[PDB]
Amino acid sequence: LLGFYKQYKALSEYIDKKYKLSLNDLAVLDLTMKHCKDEKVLMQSFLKTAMDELDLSRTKLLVSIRRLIEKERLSKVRSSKDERKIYIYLNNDDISKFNALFEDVEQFLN
């Protein structure tokens, strides 16, 4: 019980100090890998699924996605047709960063 708390606080501090990422960010990033490794996904559509899967609010998700993008761990492209349609996706660099990051998580914990 208290055991989870310690490892959790610990993981949170570690990732924050090293990556300037929160655990929300990690959870969102993990989810992007299940949705836009290959294809690009519409922002609105990912937001919907992320809310359901992560029980996170719309703005919290937006904050996370924007931070991942600013930190060069996630990518975006707009529609040339509709100025308001935005997609996210992971390029190869993003994927290699993803893998490095989650190997780091795995070893901290276990």
* Token representation of residue 23: 């655990």
The span from the CA of 95 to the CA of 84, in Å, is: 26
The span from the CA of 59 to the CA of 57, in Å, is: 6
Closest CA to 85 of 94, 75, 76: 76
Range of the domain at 2: 1-110
CB atoms within 10 A of CB 88: 22
Percentages (nearest 5) of helix, strand, coil residues in the chain: 65, 10, 25
Q: What domain count does the chain have?
A: 1
Q: Regarding beta strands 41-42 and 75-78, do their DSSP bridges make them parallel or antiparallel, or are they unpaired? A: unpaired
The span from the CA of 16 to the CA of 84, in Å, is: 32
The span from the CA of 11 to the CA of 22, in Å, is: 10
Residue with the two structure tokens 């190997």: 103
